Homo-oligomer: A and B are copies of this chain.
Amino acid sequence: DSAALDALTAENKKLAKQ
């Protein structure tokens, strides 16, 4: 789902920002 894809995008962005 788009919600799952956005969650994955947020997780990757979070790792990159950390």
Interface residues of A, Cβ cutoff 8 Å to B: 1-2, 4-5, 8-9, 11-12, 15-16
Complex copy number for this chain:
8
Residues on the B chain within 8 Å of A15, using CB: 16
**Chain B residue at minimum C-beta to C-beta distance from A13:** B11
Contact partner of A4 (CB less than 8 A), chosen from B5, B12, B16, is B5
A18 to B: closest C-beta gap in Å: 11
Residues on the B chain within 8 Å of A11, using CB: 12
Residues on the B chain within 8 Å of A16, using CB: 15
**Chain B residue at minimum C-beta to C-beta distance from A16:** B15
Residues on the B chain within 8 Å of A1, using CB: 2
Residues on the B chain within 8 Å of A8, using CB: 5, 8-9, 12
